[PDB]
Symmetry: D2
C-alpha cells in the first residue's frame, strides 16, 4: 500500500495524548477523519494537498494513534479538541476537509462554536439526524457483550463493519491499516466504547443552526454509501451548500478508499 502518514507530534488535550502531523507549507488546511478510522484515510490525499497548503491532520481522541481512554470520546468532546488544536496551531480561517464524524465535528465547531473557516469540503458527513446503522444501534445496547468477544470474533466484526463503508473491497493490507488500532485489548474496548457513546443530540444541536455560511461549502458524496442514503446528502447540500452536491459514482461511505482522486479534485479544482 501507499505509505502511512507520519503523525510525529503529540498534543496534550486535558491529560490525553493526541497524535498529529503536518505536510507542506502555505495556507492552512486541516483534515478531520471519522469513525472507525484515523488520519490514515488521508494517506493518498494529504500529500497532494500539501503541494500548495500546510496540511494538518490529527487522530480523534479515542481513535488511531491518539489515546483511547475510558472517558468521553463522543462528538460532545471532539469539537472541543478541534478548537484546541486550531489554537495550538495558531491558525485562523483554515481550509477544512472532513469526513463522517469529522464532518459532524467541524460543523459543530462552526455552527455551535463560531469558528471561521476559509472554505469547507465535507465527505459523506454525518450531519443530519437521526444517524447510525443498525449494527451501531444494536451494539450500543450490549457493549459489554461485544467487548468480551474472543479476539478472532472481534477481528471478524471489525473487518465486516469496515467493509460496509466501501464499494470496492479493500486488500487485507489496506484493511489492516484501519483495523489494527482496534485489535489490542485497549483498542477492542475502545472500538465498542465510541459506538456506545454515540448520541443523536450531538448532531441535532448543530443541525438546528444550519444555514449557508460566510465561506464556500462543498460536499463530496459517494453515491453507494450503505450507511447514509444519497437523498440525505442532497438534503444537506440544500441546507448549507445551495443545493450543490459532488456525487461520486461507484464510491461508498469511505470515498478516501474508493475514489481518493474525487476528494483531491474537489479541493484543488474548487
Amino acid at each position: 500500500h501507499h505509505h502511512m502518514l507520519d503523525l510525529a507530534n503529540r498534543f496534550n488535550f486535558e491529560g490525553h495524548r493526541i497524535a498529529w502531523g503536518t505536510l507542506g507549507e502555505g495556507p492552512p488546511l486541516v483534515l478531520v477523519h471519522g469513525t472507525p478510522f484515523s488520519s490514515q484515510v488521508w494517506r493518498r490525499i494529504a500529500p497532494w494537498l500539501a503541494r500548495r497548503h500546510r496540511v494538518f491532520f490529527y487522530d480523534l481522541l479515542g481513535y488511531g494513534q491518539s489515546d483511547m481512554p475510558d472517558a468521553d470520546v463522543s462528538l460532545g468532546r471532539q469539537n472541543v479538541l478541534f478548537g484546541a488544536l486550531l489554537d495550538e496551531w495558531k491558525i485562523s480561517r483554515p481550509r477544512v476537509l472532513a469526513h463522517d464524524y469529522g464532518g459532524a465535528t467541524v460543523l459543530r465547531a462552526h455552527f455551535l462554536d463560531g469558528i471561521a473557516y476559509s472554505d469547507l469540503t465535507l465527505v459523506n458527513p454525518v450531519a443530519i439526524a437521526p444517524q447510525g446503522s443498525p449494527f451501531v444501534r444494536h451494539v450500543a445496547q450490549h457493549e459489554a457483550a461485544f467487548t468480551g468477544l474472543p479476539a478472532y470474533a472481534h477481528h471478524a466484526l471489525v473487518s465486516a463493519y469496515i467493509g460496509q463503508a466501501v464499494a470496492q473491497p479493500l486488500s487485507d493490507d489496506v484493511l489492516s491499516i484501519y483495523r489494527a488500532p482496534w485489535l489490542t485489548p485497549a483498542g477492542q474496548a475502545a472500538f465498542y466504547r465510541q459506538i456506545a457513546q454515540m448520541r443523536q443530540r450531538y448532531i441535532e444541536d448543530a443541525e438546528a443552526r444550519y444555514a449557508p455560511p460566510d465561506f464556500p461549502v462543498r460536499i463530496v458524496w459517494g453515491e453507494d454509501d450503505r450507511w447514509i442514503p444519497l437523498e440525505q446528502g442532497q438534503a444537506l447540500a440544500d441546507r448549507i451548500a445551495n443545493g450543490k452536491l459532488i456525487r461520486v459514482p461507484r464510491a461508498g461511505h469511505l470515498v478516501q478508499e474508493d475514489a481518493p482522486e474525487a476528494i483531491v479534485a474537489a479541493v484543488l479544482d474548487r
Copy 2:
C-alpha cells in the same frame, strides 16, 4: 465443490420434520454430524462408504435441512431422535460414524440408552466434560444480544466461527454450504438457540458410564482441533478404546474437510 448429499426424506419426530437420506446397499452404517454443521460434512465420505454399506445420514433436530424449532434441540433431545430413527429405519446393530455432538449423541445412545452397534468410529467427538470453545462459552450468555445482530454481522461471526474448525481454510463455496442454514431469520435464531441450550450434564451423564463397549471402537482425531484439546481425545481413547487413538496431523476439528481420506481409511481399512 463436490455434490451435496441428497437428504430427500422427511421423518416426523414429535411433530418436527427431520431431513435424512441414504446411499448404497449392504450392512447398515449411520452417519451423525455435529454442531454447527449438517450431513453435508459427509458429502466426500458417504459415497465411498456406500460402495459396500447401506449408508444413512440425517440432520440433527435444529440443524441443516431439518426443522429448527423454538424447542429443545440440545443433546438431551438428540439421542431420543437417534434411537427413533434407528427404529424407523428398522436397523439393528448399525456401524456408526459420528462427529462432535454427533459423537456425544451416539455415546449417550449407547451408554445411557443401551443401543448396540456393530462398531463405532468417532471423529473429534465431544465426549469428555467440560467442553466449549471461548466463542460458544461467551455467546451462551448473550443469546438475544447475538440473534439481534444485522444479517451481515451475524454473517461475519458465523463465517469466522466455522473457520475455527479447520486447519486449511475453506473455499467460499464450501464455507457457504455450512453457513447458509444459519442465515435466514429462523436459522439465525436457531444458531444461537442451540448454543444457549448447551449443558455439560449431557456429556457428564454418558462419561460416568464410559468403558470399552461390546463392539470395536476407533477414534479419528484431528490434532490441531481448536475446539477440543488433544488431552480429551487421549482421555477418551484410554477410557473406551484401550489407548488407541488415530491422530490426524495438520487436521483441525472438521476432519471431514481437512482430511476426509483419514475417515474413509478408518472406516474401510479395518
Copy 3:
C-alpha cells in the same frame, strides 16, 4: 469497479475504425493511453478532468476497442492517427495528458510533426531510448510461438505481464478490463503483433529533438515502475522540464491504477 469510459464514437483512419469518446465542456484536453492498455486507464481520471475541460480520449490503433488490423500499429503510425484526430475534432493547442507509448506518440507529434499544445502532462512516458521489458524483448523474437498458445496459457501470460505494471495488485475485475481485448483470436494475435512491431527508432527520432517546448510541461513518475528505470525519467525531465519530476511513491508504471489521484492533482493543481 468504477464505470468503464464510454467510447461510443468511431473515426475512420485509413480504413480502420478508431474508438473514441468525449466528456465535459470547455477547453480541450486530450488523453492518450499506452501499451498494452486502452482509454480505460482514464476511467477514474477523465470524469474529474471533465468538470472544467472537454476531455477527448481514443484507443490507439491496435488497442482496446479500436480495430486490430494485421497492419502497421507501431509508434510510426500512432502519431499520424493522433494528428488526424486533432484535425477531425477541430481542436487547437489542446491540453494533453499521455502515458507510456501515448507519451511517445504526443512527443513525436510535437517534436517531429510540429503540433502545438497548450500544456503537456506526461505519465511514465516511453521517451528515452532504449526501452523494453524482458518479456517484450523475448516475446518480440517469437511472435508465432506465443500467438499459437492455447487461450488459457495466453490468458496467464497477459495477466502476468499486465501485473508487472502495478505496485498494488489489481482486482480480477479491474485486471479483466485491460486483459479482455487481448483474449479474442484477433486480440491474441494483436497483442503479440504490437510487441513484434516495436522499434527503438520511433523513440530515438523524437529524442534527438528534445528541448523545453513552448508550453508548460510536467512529468508524473511512478517511482516503482518495473518497465522504465527512474534514471530515464529524470533524463527526460532534464531535457524538456528543467529537471522536474512529480514523483509518485509506491506507484508502478500504471500510475492510473496505483495512484490516479496523483495524475488528477498534477493536471488540476497546475
Copy 4:
C-alpha cells in the same frame, strides 16, 4: 497444507540420483506419480495406505526431488528406472498405484518388460494413444522460446498449466508444492525438456500388448479430467479391467488433490 512426504533416500540410476522414501511395514505397495508432478501427490494418501503396507514412492527421473539432467527423461527411460528400483528394493509382485505418466510407466513395465504385479490401481492414466493437451503439443514444438521466458512469466505458465489438472483450484501453498521444483534455472529448463521429449510411440508400444492380466486391475477416473477424454479411460477399462471404471465425480486429472479419499477407498476397500 498437509506436510510433504519425506523422500529420505537416494538411488543411483545410471549416474543420476533418484529420490525415494518409504512408510509403513507389510506387503509392498509402490506409488508412481506423473507429469508435471512428484511423489508429493501422495502426501495425503501414502500415510493411510501405510497402516497395513510397506509403501514405496519415488520421483521420476527429471521430476520432483530427483535429478533433472539434460538427458532422456521420457517414458522410454522411466520404465527402466521403475524396474531397477523394484530390483533394488528386492520386492516381488508388488501392489501398484500409479497416476498419469506413472500409469504409462507401470503399464510399459508390465506389458513390455514382463514385471508381475499382485494388484494394479491406475488413476487417470496416460495409456491410450494419442495423448497430449494442446499446450503440451505446442510447447513441445517451440522449446527454446519457452525455456527462455522471464522467471515471472514461466511461473505464471507453470501455475496455469497445473491449474488445468484440478476441478477445485489449489491454494497457493499447495500449488507451490508442485510448482517449486520447476522454478530454479535448472527446473525451468527441465520443465520444458520433459514436455519436448514426449512421443506417442511410448504409449503405442504398450497399448499394442494390452490384455487382461493375471492380477486385479482397478481404474480410478476423475470425470472432469481436462487432459484425457473419459472415452479413453473406458477404452482402457474395456481392454485390461473387464470394462469397470471407478468414476470420481467433480474431480479432474489430479484426483489426488480433488478427491484423495477416492483413491484411498479404491485401494483399501477390497
